[PDB]
Structure formats: C-alpha cells, structure tokens
Symmetry: C4
Subunit: 442 residues, 4 copies
C-alpha cells in the first residue's frame, strides 16, 4: 500500500562508522617540508585562524585568560555560558581589549574621579594607563594616570585632580597606526600615546604593550582592527537572544549556539531567529552527526557547523542513551554535506593525541575543538595546588597553553608532510586513509 513501507525496518543495521583508532593516513608524494606547510584556516571572512584549534566553551576550559592565550597562539577560545550574561560579556570585553583595545573607543576619567576608578580600569583590562579628560561632555584631554603614578599613591580614595601631575603630554592624531606609534614612542621615550583630534578631544590610546604583543605573538588571530578574536557559548533557551545581544554589544566575533542534539526544531528555529536579527554575526551551531542535520543547520543560517555526538571524553551519551556516531564517520558525513554549501565544520570531541587531530582535519573538518586536552593548562580556569607531590588544577597540570599547542601543531605539520599537503585545503580534499583491525592498532 505504501512504497517501500519496510525500507526503514530493513535498513536498521546497514550503516558502519569509523573512529580515530580504526584508521591511519596514507603517505603520498610530498614536495613540501613540515616547517614550510601552512596551518592557517578560514572559518569565514571575519574569522581567520592561524592554527586550526578552538578551545571548548566549558567552565573547566575557557574564560578570558584561556581565550587570550588561544588567540595569541592563532586559535580561538569560546567563553563558556556557566556565568551570568553581564559576566560573559565582560569576559568577552577583556579579550577584545587585551591589545589594540582602546585605539578607537577609549576609556577615560575626569579629575573628579577617585584613584579607585583608575585601579579598576587598569586591573580590569591590564592596560597601564588611564586617559583623563576635563569633562564627560567635551572630553578634552587634560592628562593621564599611569602604573608609575600609582607607585607613589598610598591612599586610593583621593580625587585624580590631586594626584595628577601636570606634565607636558605627547599626543598623536586620530588614525595613527601601531607602526607609526612605535616610532613616536621610541622617539620621545614614552610608553603611552593618547590620540586626539584637532580640538584636543581624546579619540584613543596606544600603548607600548599594543606594540610589544604584536612582536611577542606574531601568529595571533585578530579581527580587522587588530584585536584578538573571541567566541562565546549561548544555550538554546528563552533568554538566548538577551545573552547574544550583550555579547554582540561587547564585540564578540562568533557565538556558539550549543546543544546536545543540534538536529531539533528548537535549535533550527533559534538559528533562523538569530540569523535574521544579525545577518553578519558568525554563528557556530551544533552538535550534529549527520549529513541531514548539517544541511538543516546550514539552511537555518549557521555558517559553521559543529560536529560530534558521543565522542566527547566525559560524555555518557553512548552508555546512558545508547546514542552516537563514530567521530571520523560523523566528520566525513557532515563535511560531505557542508562542502556543497562552502560551509566549514568543527570536529568537536574525542581527540586524545595530535594524530587524531590530523585525522579529523583529513576527514574534512576545518578546525578541531579540544576540551580535555586543554583543561590542565595554566590558563584554564581553576586554582593550582600541590597534592601528591604533583601540581594540579582544582586534573594533572600541563603547563602553559603554548607548550601543548606547539606539540599539536608539530604533529599536524608532520602529518601534512607525509600526505604532501602544503595547506589544510589540500589535506581535506586529498588525504586518503587505510582501515585496520584492532591488531593493526597494537
């Protein structure tokens, strides 16, 4: 009575899937050394990473310090949502203002503010000077209070007019760039360069640190104005939009609309809704494990699709619900769909060693997301303690993020050398795998 009414019944057991340990990458003809290989990857025009790594949006993984360390390495951190909306937008603000933060949109105080406000702004952003203007209306620059002024201030409750030295200031015009500022800073022997207009109105501030961080971290992943990229997690809930609004106002570069099952009508509706209010916002949506789910999220408006159901190290999804797809099959199936739209995928979960990362990228993902490999690095949230004669996060202490990133990227370049891939696109398009038994694993 119905065409192939028994089709769904008969296909129950047909699909097979492969995980990382089921395969190896086959060496191919290579003209390129691992060090000359390119690890850059573009998630979109406004998200351009210099290494294909994202730190997960978990409370044991990414807050502002992690997001800053990641972007400095060329990757992207995703600030977790296990805090209030204001706290999350503030975390975003700290990443965006870490460097090149106040060049076009400076903070400032009047002489009538207390030295407390200076300590607050310098503590909050880790910027060592606060411009001072005559009043909040004209905003004419009368001076600056710096970390060096604070050396001599005992009580902080006093007016800034009291403590402010009236000294000859060096200013530069609006539009002064970093490399120009570096010369002006070198010339007059100063660490701070307020930018003003023709009327003496403060438009901006450049610091020696804005210049030093460019040198210290040449691989930083930055926006068009030179500020570190940052993402932020958002749940699918009634208040998602309120949360997104505050993040966008804090100048977040991407939101991750994250849920256990991305293939639900609620998630699709939420992406449609966020896409409509914000045509240009980078929307990473997940989590999905099928070609059909990938197509639905893309057509709802997601521009990055996040892949993985069940592979996560601490996910009970497989044991409790019986649900999952082996991660390489999931990445490959989703990338097969997403390729047709020009849409990149993130491989989220189940990565143990750098080799797994190489495999995930070779199976078609543009980028991998790591929680557990990053949870013990120094910049992750949570305190250090010594307990077993061992330093711990309160999980084994891994040291600075940079050491872990360096090993991951080293592994990736090696893998790329073997596969003859000069860049990640060639790797996704061309790399071949060979399947092996469990005996082939040992």
């Amino acid at each position: 009575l119905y065409f192939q009414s028994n089709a769904m019944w008969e296909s129950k057991f047909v699909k097979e899937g492969l995980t990382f340990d089921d395969v190896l990458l086959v060496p191919a003809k290579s003209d390129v050394l691992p060090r000359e290989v390119s690890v850059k990857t573009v998630l979109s025009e406004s998200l351009q990473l210099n290494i294909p790594l994202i730190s997960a949006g978990m409370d044991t993984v990414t807050e502002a310090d992690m997001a800053i360390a990641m972007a400095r390495q060329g990757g992207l951190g995703i600030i977790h949502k296990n805090m209030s909306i204001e706290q999350q937008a503030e975390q975003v603000d700290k990443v965006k203002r870490s460097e090149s933060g106040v060049i076009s949109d400076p903070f400032f105080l009047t002489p009538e503010h207390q030295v407390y406000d200076a300590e607050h702004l310098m503590g909050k952003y880790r910027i060592s000077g606060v411009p001072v203007v005559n009043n909040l209306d004209e905003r004419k620059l009368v001076g600056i209070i710096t970390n060096r002024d604070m050396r001599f201030i005992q009580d902080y409750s006093i007016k800034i007019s009291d403590v402010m030295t009236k000294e000859q200031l060096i200013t530069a015009p609006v539009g002064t760039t970093l490399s120009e500022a570096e010369k002006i800073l070198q010339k007059y022997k100063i660490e701070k360069l307020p930018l003003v207009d023709n009327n003496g109105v403060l438009q901006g501030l450049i610091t020696i640190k804005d210049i030093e961080k460019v040198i210290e971290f040449p691989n930083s992943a930055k926006d068009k104005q030179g500020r570190l990229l940052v993402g932020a997690a958002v749940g699918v809930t009634a208040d998602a939009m309120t949360r997104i609004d505050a993040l966008v106002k804090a100048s977040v570069d991407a939101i991750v609309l994250d849920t256990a099952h991305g293939h639900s009508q609620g998630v699709i509706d939420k992406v449609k809704e966020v896409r409509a209010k914000y045509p240009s916002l980078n929307i990473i949506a997940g989590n999905v494990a099928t070609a059909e789910a990938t197509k639905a999220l893309i057509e709802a408006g997601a521009n990055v699709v996040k892949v993985g159901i069940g592979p996560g190290s601490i996910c009970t999804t497989r044991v409790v619900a019986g649900v999952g797809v082996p991660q390489l099959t999931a990445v490959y199936d989703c990338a097969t769909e997403a390729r047709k739209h020009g849409i990149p995928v993130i491989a989220d979960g189940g990565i143990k060693y750098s080799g797994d990362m190489v495999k995930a990228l070779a199976a078609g993902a543009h980028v991998v997301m790591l929680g557990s490999m990053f949870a013990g690095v120094a910049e992750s949230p949570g305190e250090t303690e010594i307990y077993q004669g061992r330093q711990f996060k309160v999980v084994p202490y891994k040291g600075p993020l940079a050491d872990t990133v360096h090993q991951l990227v080293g592994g990736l370049r090696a893998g790329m050398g073997y596969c003859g891939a000069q860049d990640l696109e060639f790797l996704r398009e061309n790399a071949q795998f060979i399947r092996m038994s469990g005996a082939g694993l040992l």
Copy 2:
C-alpha cells in the same frame, strides 16, 4: 538426487549477529523533548505498562514485594516458580490485593473468630481493617476491626465479639468509586468505608490507602478494576496446568511459560494446551532467538514472545553448550517475524546500562526484562547485611527499586529525544543504528 542437498552444509558459517556493544543509535531530526516523550507500551489489551520494564521470574529477583514495587513504577513483576503452587498463588494474591483489592470481593470474619484471624488478614494483605459480618450465610455487616482496635488488645486469642466496639458505622453503596469514597472518607473523617447493599450485606471495602496509593504512584500499571498487574512463571512440566489453574484462580494477569529452549515440540504443545483451556489468558512464551521459533510459538497461541538464548549475565549456555545468538540480532530477527502477526517481543537478558535498553527497544522489542540489574534493589528477595563496611543482599545493595527505574527511564527518554521518537512505536519502526569496531567502543 536431492534439490540443493548441500545447501545446509554450505550455509553453516554464513549468518552474522550483533550485540549491544557492536552498535550505536543514530541521532535523527527531533521535535520532542525527553520529558514530553511517551514511554507507555501495550503488551495486550489486558496488559498495559507505563514503562517498558519487566522484572525477571528469578528467586533472587521477584516475589510479591518486588512485583508490587514494579507495578507501582508502571512495569510488571514476574513471580518466580521456585516455590510451591499454593505459595505462588498466594504471592499473586498479595500483589492483586495490595490496592483496590477488596472493593468487589472482600474478606470478612464473624464475631466468633479470634483476633488472630484479624491479625492474619491484616498482615497477609497489609490492609488495616477487617469487616465483620453476623454469619457466613447472610453476611450482614455488624462492624469492623481495625489496626487502631489492635492498639488496645493485648491477648489475640479472644473472640472478636468481645473486642468489637459497637459503634455507628458509615457505609456506602455497591459501585461507589474511589474518587467518591475519597469525599465520603474526607466528609465523615474516617479511614475505612465498607460497601453494602440494600439489605446490609457486605459487598466490599474501600480504605484511605486505596486512595492514597493512586496519588503516591500515578504511573502504576493496573488492571481494569484498579489492581496492580502481576505475572507468574510456570515451567513446562506435567504439573504446569495445575500450577496455571491456581494462578488464574488467584487472578494473575499473565503467565510466563519459561524454558531454556522455547523452540521445542514440548513447549509448543504446552502453549497450545494452555491457549485452548484459557482463550483470554496472557501467555508469554520463551525463550527463542530465531524468526522460525517466534512464528511457531505465536501460532501455538502465545501472545507475547520472550527473546534471548545465551545473553543472560549468569547463563553458561555459550561456554558450556556453545550455543547462543547475539542479543540485538535475536531481538531484531524475532521482531521481524512477530511484527507480521501484531505480536510484541520481550528482550530478555544481557542488559548492563540504560543505553542497552534503548538499543533493545530500538531493535524491535516492546519491553525489556532485567534480572541482574534488579537483584540488589531493596524490594528483591533476601536479607540485608553489612559485611565489608558495605550493605549487601544475601551482591551490592542498590537501594529502592524506584531509584534504579528512574535512571533507566531517564536514559530511555534521552535516547528517544535523540532519535526523534515521541513514543516507543516510532522508536521500533524508525530508529537506525550504525555499526562500529571494538575501537569504536573505546
């Protein structure tokens, strides 16, 4: 000389089968939240469960206390056969009379009975009042002896005429329902409501507990008269019928005709025989692992087929006899046959975690049976002891049945959310699996 005489020889090694750890369920488009999902399942018109769980017919698993706890949770207990016929029918009687038990067919005493008979009836059924009638012939209600009367009785050997307070009784008519009784009980401030006819003849009794248990356990699996469902195990033996007769007279809702190999002529004959004497009796017959065995038991008259040979945790069948079928293949093969007849299957054995249960239902079973997951819960038979600083059953103590059921059902709803299944029928019909290697398990 014979058509395909070598066919049986050549097919020896052809079949493959899959067990729980060989597969995962694939997420599908979902419009439905895990909490709004329906876990109800119908085994037949007279057996309707509110969660798809049955407690096994083993002496370490199910006696009256377990059967009562299970049915209260919405499932079904199967009283084991490792006791005498009278003991088993009595166990059945206790479950059926746990609540709403005496509404149409009350127990009663005369004034000439001893208070011992009252203690016995109240102990046996956990019902706190015993109606008293003038004589066994007219059965005219003269009073009631309750748990509160017993507070003041020291010696129990005395006549009930001595101890019975002559007090104004409140009675209601035959056909009074629970929700009516609740109002009458509230109004006159009483805990017991004998039901009588126009001549004062006792027809029944309702208690506040009959009303309270409906509220306390809104998911109870009950018969048409509001009594807890119960099953009972029967062996295939010469005295099976004698045993079945007593169980049916005790108002059992199903019998499980249980044997190691259900595919034997003796079992088929026994089902034919029981079906013939009792056209309406629910007959669960097992155990089978093939489509052919399923068809034979169905045509013999079984209305539920029990599936599993060798997967049971304590079965030596695989090691000793070399025999078995991987449980998901068994469930699927049997359900493929049983679907054609509109007959449900029970997946019996080999379930470790809730995920396995989700998989068994997704492979086509209507219901799973669990022995070992239930053997340590409080309501299972056997005493508590402390031994290793650990509470034990004399096996690790799992606490109340309700805690274990809550985790199982939580896992099931999650799995159903992932698969987009609003109800168990959709799950059986539509859920897809993906096969994975042993590396995909880790």
Copy 3:
C-alpha cells in the same frame, strides 16, 4: 605467456578463517531431550566409540591407565611413542587384556615356575589368577594360583608345585560366554573359570572381574571380542614399520601416524606403505589443515584424518613459524573434502571448554582429541604431590577422568538439544553457526 601467471600472487590475502570464539551455534527446532540424545560415533567398523573423545598421544596425557579409563568411558586413548617399541606394545597389551583379555589366548605357568612368575603376570595385567598346566606342550590344566593363595605365601622364590593346592577345580567349555560364566560363577560360588577342551587342555580363562567391569562401565568402547579399544602413536621415521609391527602383534586397534606437517610426501609415502602391508589396520593420519591435504592422506590410504595445525595450546607453530589455520575453518574445510569419501575427521587441538567441543563436532568432525584438558586427571601419567596447599600432577589436579568426561558430555548433550540433533550425524549435517565480533564474545 602463462595462463593466470599472477593468480597465486593475487590470492595471497583472500582466505578468511574462524576459530571457536568467533561463533555460536544457532538454536533450531528440537523434539529431543539432552538425555535421550545419542553421543555414539563410528570411526570405522572396527572402531566404534560411545562418546566422541580421544585422549592425545602425549607423554603427559596417555599411557595404559589413561587408555583404560578412556575406553571405559566410551572413548579411545592413544598410547604415546616417547618410549621404546617393546614398552609401547606392552602398554597396548595391558589395555587389551584389562578385561576379557584371556578368554581365547590365556597366559599360563607350569608347576616348575616360581611364584615370582605368578606375581609378575598378576601385577602386569591386574588379573588375579594364573592358570597352571602340566607342561608347555600338552598344556593340560592341573590347577590355578590366585591372589588368595598369595595371602599365605611368604617367600615367592619357591616352585609353584610346592604352593599349589590340589583342589577340585570347576572348568567350563570353550565358547562359554560372559553371561553364561556369570551364572556358573554364581552357582558354584567361585571367582575364576578356566575354559578347557574335551581333552582337558586349557583354552582360556574368565574371571568375575571380566563380568563386573561390564556392569561397572556399561559405556565401554570395545572390540568384537569384548576387549577395550586402544590406539597408539607412531612417528614417520625409518623404524615406524618395526614399531607398527609390534603394535599390531599386540592387537592395537588403531595407529596414529602423527607428524607436525601431514601434507608432506614422506607422510603420504608412509601411509601408502602401511596401508599396503596392513589392508585392515585403522590408520589415523595427521596433522592437516586443508582440503587438499585431507584428500592426499585419504588417497594414500588413511581412514581417519586428524586436523589441526597451530591451534594446540602448547604449540609455538603460530608464533615461531607464522603458520596455522583457525581451527573451525580447518575442521570445516577438511570435513568438506572427507565427507565426499565417507571419511571421518578428528579435531585435534585448541579445545578449552565443552562448548568448543560442540562447535568442533558441529563444524564436521566426528571426534575431538584433547591433550591439555586431560593432563591433570588422576589417570594421566605422572605423580601426585602437594605443593601450594594444592594437589598437583608432576599442573592442577583434576580428579578422576570420569568427572571431566561427565561435564564434557553433559555440555555436548545440551548443545545437541539446542540444535535439535538426536545424533552426531544430524549435528554435523545440519547445525548452523552465527558469526560474532569480539564484543559479542564479552
């Protein structure tokens, strides 16, 4: 230039094979209870076993005591070749004469022999009487010296004429059978019945033990004259024939021409040679693992083919030489060839539990051979000691052979019940397997 010159190169990796843990037997419709099932199997007209078990021809497994215990259970022992030719033929002689041994071909002494010769013959055969005749020429019976005569003899160096009581003897005629003898023994109240002809010439002896052992072991595997069956191992070497000659003269029922690689021209030549000198001798030849090797040994004249290369528990063949075939594939491939000739196969090696035995028979073997499962039973060679608070063979002590056989056969009957097999032929012809993953094993 050559037809398919690359065929051998391209087929290198094509074959797959299965071992015991790769499969389970599928239950089939059964009309037959495990206890009414027949476990008999015929290796040839002159070798008919009552259980399908053979004890291996290893020095830690089978000497006369083991061979006797095995045949009593219905199986066959194979006396190992790690002794001299005379020692091996003597071991064979002890098995054949264990019961019904001296009925047609008696030992005897004259009065001039010492009591030492009586002790020797009674010790050697465990027969408690020695017939005495007047001289080696007439062989006329003058009396008998028994275990009871020995009670009173202190010095054994004396002439038998001295110690022999002249007492009225009861004799029976030649051709007297056991059941007749039992009545004559009961009637005259005696334990020994010499058989003589019309002239008083000793032809034979029957003892109460010949009669008692028939009752004690109703399943004994016996030859046409009522003596226990026994086999013996022979190597392929220059002196094989000399060894075979002595075994045949000792009335061995089978020889096992045993070598690591049975598929060699030397083995085939040796079978051809032994077949030619002894047209009726049972020749078990091995070891082979392929259909082609099975055909070659059969056409060389072997009437039983022994199967297994590498599965043996203590074989290093797989690790050292890299060689082997998974045992069930080997059994099946060899049985496929051997079936065409009406030739039975023995599955030798790799059996751990009774389930494996059921599987080997279901894959087509008529009989399984066990070394390591038997090496600790009481009747195996080697002394008992207590060492770790544990009794040991000098390997864990398993107790009497009968206990191990009873568990094996119990497992076999169960398996046969499940498969609906009334006899081993039906099992070989009809049993089906299902393949499972390593996850299906756990």
Copy 4:
C-alpha cells in the same frame, strides 16, 4: 566540469590493510625438510646474503662489531650515520678489513716508524702482523712485526729498526689464494705470509686468521674478494654526497639513503644524483609504504627499496602524525610494484617474533631489517652493566648475535617447510595467508 572531480573525496575510506597479527600462513604440500631448505637471498649481483636479515642503521644497533657479526652469520649490517664522516668510513674500513683485508692492498711501515704505529694498525684492524718495507717508494719488504714481537717490547716509543728481528721470512707470490696459503702456512709452520712480486716489493699479506675465519663462519656474506659485506646509512642532506664519497672510497658495499618519508621530491632527486655519479653502487632507498612511492624510487635509480612507515617499535609516527600503513599490506603493495622491475624490497620495522619475519618474506620482501630485536645482543653498541641482578646494555642483554640469528633462522626454515618452499623465491611467489579475527589471535 572535471572528470570524476569527487573521486578523491569518495575514496577516502576505501583501503584496508593487514598487519602481522591479522594473518597466518597456510600449510601447503611439502617435499622438503626444514634443514635442506635454502635461506639465501640475492639483493643484487654484488650483494648476496646467506640469511635474509639486515641489522638496522641505528646507533643502538650497528657499528663495526655488529656489522662483522652479522656478515659472519650471512646477513648484512648497516653502520649508522650518528657519527662524523671519517668515523663512519673508518667503521666501514674495519668491517671490510676484518678478514682477507690486506691481501691486495696491504698496510705497511718503515723501520723508522715507532712501535706505536704497529700497535695502532694491529689494534685498529685486529690483524696481528704489520709488514715492514725499506721505504715508502720502493716498498721492498724487509720484515714483519707481529703480536709475538710485542710480548717482549716494553716501551713502544722506539724505532721499529731497533725491535725488528732480522730473521728468514717466508714469502709467497701475488695471486696466492687462501687455500694455497693454508698449505704454505702449514708447511713452514708460520702464521703470516707476506705476498711479494719478483722484485721483492710487498703486494699483500695473508694470515692464519684469514684462513681460520672461513672455517669458523662458513655462511659469511662476502664480496668477490672474500671480504665481509657491509652497508652504511646516509641522510638526505647537503653533505650526503661528501659522506657517500668517503664510504665508497672505504669500499662500502651498499648505502642506505634513509629518510622518514621516502616519497618526497628531495629523496628522489638525491637518488637520481647518487645513481648518476656511481652507476654500480648499491643504493637502498626508503622508507616507503606504497606502490607509487616504490615505482618512483626505482625509476630514480634505487636498486633496493626499503619498506615501512609507522610499524617501527619506537616510531611515534602513528600517534603523533596519524600516519602509517599496516606492515604486511605495505610490504605486499610495494613488492607488487617492485616485482615488475625485478627489484627486491626490505621489510623494515614491526618484527617481534620469527613468525613475523616468515610472514614479511611470504608477503614479498626479500629481506627483513631488525632494530629492536638486535639492540640487546652482545655486539650491539653500548656497555654491559649489572643492575637488577640482571645484565643490561646501557635494555635486556640477549647474549651473542649468533644465538638470536639461530632462533630466527630456525623459525624461518620451519615456516618454509610448512609452506613447501625450498627457497625464498618460491615462498614469495607461492605462499598463501588466511585472515583471522582478534579472537583467532588468542
């Protein structure tokens, strides 16, 4: 727009590969005993081995003592490159001059040299005599200083003219062979036989040791002039040629141009370049794991191809880069290509037991290379120490190379017996494998 533009994408997961534990060799008809089997193998006309074993070019495996022990056993050692060019050529020189070293191109001293130079030459080569000539121009033999002369010399700083006994010397002509020399040495009762021309000019030296070593090691792998074969590792680097030049001048028999990824344009260019400068030099090039890489190295001019990426015991290649091919598939795929050119392959890495070696040769390699199986033998580099009550290399001490070689070759002959292979060519061409599950491994 492009023919099969999606082909590379769709083939990603198609290949399967097998490692040693995935398979066993199938026994085949055999006419040949393991001891009469030939284990010889030809890598080229100028490299002819008597056992198919090469010791790896690692600093924990092969220096001069190892290379000498290996060639004496019939195999080939590869001197590692983790030393300077001069040190490596010197190591090569010691192997080539170990025996038959000075027959055509002798070292010599004048009377004006110190006894220090004699000690040096005798220490360096382990040759117990140094010819002495009148001057470096005529090179007329005036005498010889031997190990026996040194017994009486206390101070070594003295002129050789002082210490040299003027004694009647026995000389033989140029072209005198070893077997001739043996007779002359026996006849005149001497241990040293200088070879001279008609004018008394030293052309050469034969020692009793040159003769004794032929007897002691009848299986030595030697060049055309009777000197032990030796190989040497070279990296692909700017100074490779400078290194190769010195090795060729030291009369190396092969170079191994060794790199992690042999399939790179740099390696191919380097082979082309070395092939062009040295048309006759044996070039072993690696490492490759594919048919395409094998063809490229062969056409670049390599005459031996080395196979294996990732199987090496201490390689992190699989875990770190995610790259590799299961070793038997790699050997088979490469041998399939190399067969077409008449080119042999070396199976490098992943060999644990002798069985694995048999499998690698049966999959098509002419020879296996072993690092880790040899790293603890006595002749490997590094000191002995006792630490845990255990002798160690500073890794468990394996004793003399000869003991390990004897077990490997024993395993190989056994495997060859089973496969019916009289020689390694037949094994490569004809041996068949059977695939097994992980359950078939246990």
